[PDB]
Amino acid sequence: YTPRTRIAIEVEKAFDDCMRQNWCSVNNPYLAKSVSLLSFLSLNHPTEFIKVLPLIDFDPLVTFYLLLEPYKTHGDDFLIPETILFGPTGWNGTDLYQSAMLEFKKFFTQITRQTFMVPICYSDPETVHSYTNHVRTEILHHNAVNKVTTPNLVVQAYNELEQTNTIRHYGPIFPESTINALRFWKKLWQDEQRFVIHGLHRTLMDQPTYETSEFAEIVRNLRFSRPGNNYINELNITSPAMYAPNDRFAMLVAFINSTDFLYTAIPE
């Protein structure tokens, strides 16, 4: 449908293949494209590499969709601009692989001070997880766990990081490039997608037998329910306006309790 859609469909057909042929190697074409894209900005646009590095996921399938956003047709707030991806100086999806899993893991090793040369995500990413632990304890153990209270508290934590770049009033967590790229509850939209796609991907890979029906449901989720056209109204588990309902609240408690809550990338 678009150049963004073309690469995704090719990767999805390649993933459906590798799963059938030999269960791939975790994510196989998603890993190649994630690393291909992740080596391109590192070599060619270090400011955009710095902007999105704290947001990359160890699940390369999740990283692929959070970076490309191939089904986003509404808005011009792509995480990485269309010019950098498909323009005359664009990536256009050309493979930049060799030792792909080695290359992917080495990307997380780059979350350091020297790479930025300062946000706490680059200086002390372990300390950022300490701050998010405090917020997690505050919401789940220091407040009422209600349909009325908990959804509002999750948005407030993302709100503080959005406009003040702080967690527990300690900052700066991210670069300002990263902050302005996550305006209007986009990070909460990213992190619910993390939690949802993580669960279905983990389930897909844990099963004995591969069935294309389950991989299609993951793709159907990213196309029709979380395409990226409108972040706050694509919120489901984390939407306070949405509060079957207690099943939804169950995933909210699990999301806060997960590492996808206020997600930040760390070396290991």
Numbering used by the authors: 11 to 127, 139 to 264, 274 to 298
What does the paper say about this structure?
The causative agent for ASF is a DNA virus, African swine fever virus (ASFV). The polyprotein pp62 produces three mature structural proteins by the cleavage of viral protease pS273R, give rise to mature product p15, p35 and p8. Herein, we present the crystal structure of ASFV structural protein p35 (304 amino acid residues) and explore its potential role in core shell assembly. Membrane-associated proteins such as p35 may serve as a docking scaffold for the recruitment of host membrane and other components in the core shell during the virus assembly process and further stabilize the mature virion.
Due to the lack of a predicated homology model, the crystal structure of p35 is finally determined using single-wavelength anomalous diffraction (SAD) by a mercury (II) derivative and refined to 2.1  Å with a Rfactor and Rfree of 20.3% and 23.0%. While the high-resolution data were collected by the cube-like crystal grows in 0.1 mol/L BIS-TRIS pH 5.0, 25% w/v PEG 3350. In the final model, residues D1-Y11, D128-D138, G265-I273 and E299-N304 of Molecular A and B are not visible due to the lack of interpretable electron density data, suggesting their high structural flexibility. The ASFV p35 is a compact structure composed of eleven α-helices and four 310-helices. Homology search by the DALI server gives no structural homology with any identified proteins, indicating ASFV p35 as a completely novel fold structure. The structure of p35 can be described as two lobes of helix bundles, termed as a larger “head domain” and a relatively smaller “tail domain”, respectively. The head domain is a helix bundle with the central α4 surrounded by α1, α2, α3, α9 and α10, mainly stabilized by hydrophobic force, and further packed by α5, α8, and η1. The tail domain is a helix bundle composed by α6, α7, α11 and η4. In contrast, for ASFV p35, the two lobes are linked by three loops, rendering it as a much more compact structure. For ASFV p35, there are two charged patches in p35 protein surface: a continuous positive charged bulge composed of residues R16, R244, R278, and K168; and a negatively charged patch, which contains the residues D145, E147, E298, D227, and E232.
